[PDB]
């Protein structure tokens, strides 16, 4: 009964920033962490960074001075903003449900195309 | 970060054969180790977690193994609802994933 669901914004052009909404249901933000992970097209997966129940984020180490993570609690939603895109940024980007060692449930995930 | 190197990057199948894939870490993950199967447009999904156990729901021709940098994935008898990419992945410090295995019908 979990449900995590995507929302981003389609096409964007590079150097822009993007912001993606993850949706969550069934559970709670403060008892889970939510980990963002991206697939380029063709590719494998990337892990990007994971925002705790308490609050506390992680960061691919790569890219994390390009990426911030946040919640509303109150709303149920994560967050994933990205500046300065590079067309390198385009992939599918889904947001995963943490428990133990593992991503037991995962979005749908959402396409971004950064195209000028 | 420790990396995880996927073995074979494709492979192709028949219905009813029995494969291994391999995932090596190029630094001791301690069997924080979690294998995924994804299939064409959709989302990853659980499969196997801390080395050895498997997610609900998943039928038991899959098995792992695995210690130090060394983890193994094995299904008996392919099923033609078991072709797609497989990927692990480590919870040793910062989490990464392996490259992924196509498992591609012959």
């Known amino acids: 009964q979990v449900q995590l669901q995507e929302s981003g914004p389609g096409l964007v052009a590079p150097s822009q920033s993007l912001s993606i909404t993850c949706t969550v249901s069934?559970?709670?933000?403060?008892?889970?962490?939510v980990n963002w992970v991206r697939q380029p097209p063709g590719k494998g997966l990337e892990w990007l960074g994971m925002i705790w129940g308490d609050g506390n984020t992680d960061y691919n180490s790569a890219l994390k001075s390009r990426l911030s993570i946040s919640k509303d609690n109150s709303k149920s939603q994560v967050f994933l903003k990205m500046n300065s895109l590079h067309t390198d940024d385009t992939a599918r980007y889904y947001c995963?449900?943490?428990?133990?060692?593992?991503?037991?449930?995962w979005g749908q995930g959402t396409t971004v195309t950064v195209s000028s | 970060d420790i990396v995880l190197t996927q073995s074979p990057a494709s492979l192709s199948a028949s219905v009813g054969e029995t494969v291994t894939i391999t995932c090596r870490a190029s630094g001791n993950i301690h069997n924080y180790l979690a294998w995924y199967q994804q299939k064409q447009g959709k989302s990853p999904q659980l499969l196997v977690y801390?080395?050895?156990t498997l997610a609900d729901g998943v039928p038991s021709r899959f098995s792992g193994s695995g210690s130090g940098t060394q983890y193994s994935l094995k299904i008996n008898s392919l099923q033609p609802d078991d072709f797609g990419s497989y990927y692990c992945?480590?919870?040793?410090?910062?989490?990464?994933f392996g490259g992924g295995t196509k498992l591609e019908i012959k």
């Open positions: 992945q480590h919870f040793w410090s910062t989490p990464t």
């Open positions: 995963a449900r943490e428990r133990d060692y593992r991503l037991d449930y």
């Open positions: 801390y080395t050895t």
């Open positions: 069934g559970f709670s933000l403060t008892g889970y962490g």
